[PDB]
Amino acid sequence: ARQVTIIGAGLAGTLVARLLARNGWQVNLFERRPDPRIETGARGRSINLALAERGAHALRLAGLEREVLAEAVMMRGRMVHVPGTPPNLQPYGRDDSEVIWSINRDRLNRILLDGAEAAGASIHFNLGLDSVDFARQRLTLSNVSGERLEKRFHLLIGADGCNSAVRQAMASVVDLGEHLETQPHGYKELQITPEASAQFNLEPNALHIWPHGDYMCIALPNLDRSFTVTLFLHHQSPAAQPASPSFAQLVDGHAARRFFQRQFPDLSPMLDSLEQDFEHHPTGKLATLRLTTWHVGGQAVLLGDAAHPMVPFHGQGMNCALEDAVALAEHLQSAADNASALAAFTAQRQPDALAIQAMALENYVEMSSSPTYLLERELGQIMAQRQPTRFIPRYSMVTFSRLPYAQAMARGQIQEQLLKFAVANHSDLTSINLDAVEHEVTRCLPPL
Numbered sequence: 001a002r003q004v005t006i007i008g009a010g011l012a013g014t015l016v017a018r019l020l021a022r023n024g025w026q027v028n029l030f031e032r033r034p035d036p037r038i039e040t041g042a043r044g045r046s047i048n049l050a051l052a053e054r055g056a057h058a059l060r061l062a063g064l065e066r067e068v069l070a071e072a073v074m075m076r077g078r079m080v081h082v083p084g085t086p087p088n089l090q091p092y093g094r095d096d097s098e099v100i101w102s103i104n105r106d107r108l109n110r111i112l113l114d115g116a117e118a119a120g121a122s123i124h125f126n127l128g129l130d131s132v133d134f135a136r137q138r139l140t141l142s143n144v145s146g147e148r149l150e151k152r153f154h155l156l157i158g159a160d161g162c163n164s165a166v167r168q169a170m171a172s173v174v175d176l177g178e179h180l181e182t183q184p185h186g187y188k189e190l191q192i193t194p195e196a197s198a199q200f201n202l203e204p205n206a207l208h209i210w211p212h213g214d215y216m217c218i219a220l221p222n223l224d225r226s227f228t229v230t231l232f233l234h235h236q237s238p239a240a241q242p243a244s245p246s247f248a249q250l251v252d253g254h255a256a257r258r259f260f261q262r263q264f265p266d267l268s269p270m271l272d273s274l275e276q277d278f279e280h281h282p283t284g285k286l287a288t289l290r291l292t293t294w295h296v297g298g299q300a301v302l303l304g305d306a307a308h309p310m311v312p313f314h315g316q317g318m319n320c321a322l323e324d325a326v327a328l329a330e331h332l333q334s335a336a337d338n339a340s341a342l343a344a345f346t347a348q349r350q351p352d353a354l355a356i357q358a359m360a361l362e363n364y365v366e367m368s369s370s371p372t373y374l375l376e377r378e379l380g381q382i383m384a385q386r387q388p389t390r391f392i393p394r395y396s397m398v399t400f401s402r403l404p405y406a407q408a409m410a411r412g413q414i415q416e417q418l419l420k421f422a423v424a425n426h427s428d429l430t431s432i433n434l435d436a437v438e439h440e441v442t443r444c445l446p447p448l
């Protein structure tokens, strides 16, 4: 049986462990954290993510989708909250088959852990990867106390997140051609209780947004009607705009409350523990990291966040990580050797990871922010009605299809260009020749 060592029992690592182990591979998975399935007396916060078709299909292939969806909250559309106006629901798709799912991160991780062990993988917790000796095929792990353990490896999979120790080790034997693009927004996680969400009539079957230009809040529902609220806000105020809001200006919980009362007045009354959450929850960091190289011969490979950290504005990081796990398991299972598998995996996934990284950055302005843009959307809907196999909105291609991200981006750009060009020099839909725009759709977009 072929052997593999996986670092990181997160989302991609556990899925790839199950897929390989059920194909008869001898799988050892090492995780720095303790086993979350071991119930303790600790009070762990109910953080969520959005599961879309790419992640759902990966779980479906693994035979875990039904179990994950049993605890997932349907999000039918985007609920935009702007003070003065009642909340407006913008459905994401054509019906309830085109929705996204709010899932508890910890619950998803537990189902994946159970799944990997059921398939025969061995999971070793409280062991963090410190270093790799590629020449000797040995690695060094340690617990929180720094007590070291050395292990031999045959194939190493780095599924160890955005601050990957496997990636750092690879960078000592190969030039990974890394480019780090820091993101100016930090994030803070806050909570809305089930009582508060019900009192203020907050729709449970929607993804909620409080746009505010340079900053915003997003809320995702939980099964118990609580919501996680995430504030995206600059770590520091820029030189050009010193007065502009930032985390640096919010010195304590009381400052955060005054900021919410002024900038998010319909949201602040729903945030009962705002002061405590602000002070006790650390401010998260966001970034985009692009690598030229994801592997070292047939010895080691990166996937998910270890390979391609991205900004979370499209809710596609986990979806991409699960899609990566399927691709990696498929290449490893069927290749002539590990070296061929790793090179083919990298060649297939790298253009798609770059496309989703770019689309995730672009989606911030879509959420956080026009007379011309409403005319564009109206025109885009007519085109989607007239040519349903040619004109598919970019959000739908990314979220509800398994079309390669690079193709979704390329088709999305043609669509965005067509709409922009068509509405330019026109104030309304009645002055636009619909058949001429449709001819450009049939000319530039092959049917899918």
Ligand SMILES: Cc1cc2nc3c(=O)[nH]c(=O)nc-3n(C[C@H](O)[C@H](O)[C@H](O)COP(=O)(O)OP(=O)(O)OC[C@H]3O[C@@H](n4cnc5c(N)ncnc54)[C@H](O)[C@@H]3O)c2cc1C
Binding pocket: 007, 008, 009, 010, 011, 012, 013, 030, 031, 032, 033, 048, 049, 050, 051, 127, 128, 129, 130, 159, 160, 161, 162, 163, 164, 165, 166, 187, 230, 284, 303, 304, 305, 306, 312, 314, 315, 316, 317, 318, 319, 320, 321
């Ligand atoms: C604010 C925010 C919101 C997000 N929202 C969404 C969303 O709605 N939808 C979505 O699709 N994605 C979302 N994402 C992205 C998503 O969280 C990640 O892309 C996803 O978790 C990546 O999966 P992974 O397995 O590659 O990494 P991880 O899930 O981070 O797993 C890495 C694992 O490796 C372990 N580890 C780390 N270092 C070591 C080491 N040295 N040795 C051993 N183990 C180690 C970690 O403890 C962890 O268990 C969000 C991310 C952020 C920051």
Ligand SMILES: O=C(O)CCn1c(=O)oc2cc(OCC3CCC3)c(Cl)cc21
Binding pocket: 048, 049, 050, 078, 100, 207, 218, 220, 228, 230, 312, 313, 314, 315, 316, 363, 366, 367, 399
């Ligand atoms: O354009 C839209 O209406 C939604 C885009 N999007 C998506 O489909 O899933 C998301 C998940 C997101 O983050 C959720 C986590 C922050 C802590 C929970 C964000 Cl920031 C954006 C998206």
Ligand SMILES: O=C(O)CCn1c(=O)oc2cc(OCC3CCC3)c(Cl)cc21
Binding pocket: 417, 418, 419, 421, 422, 426, 431, 432, 433, 436, 437, 440, 444
């Ligand atoms: O009556 C009207 O409103 C204009 C119709 N019209 C036309 O006569 O030629 C067009 C060519 C167009 O696009 C060419 C390239 C931009 C990406 C393909 C468009 Cl989008 C619209 C037209």
Ligand SMILES: [Cl-]
Binding pocket: 310, 311, 312, 313, 314, 315, 316, 317, 318
């Ligand atoms: Cl994301």
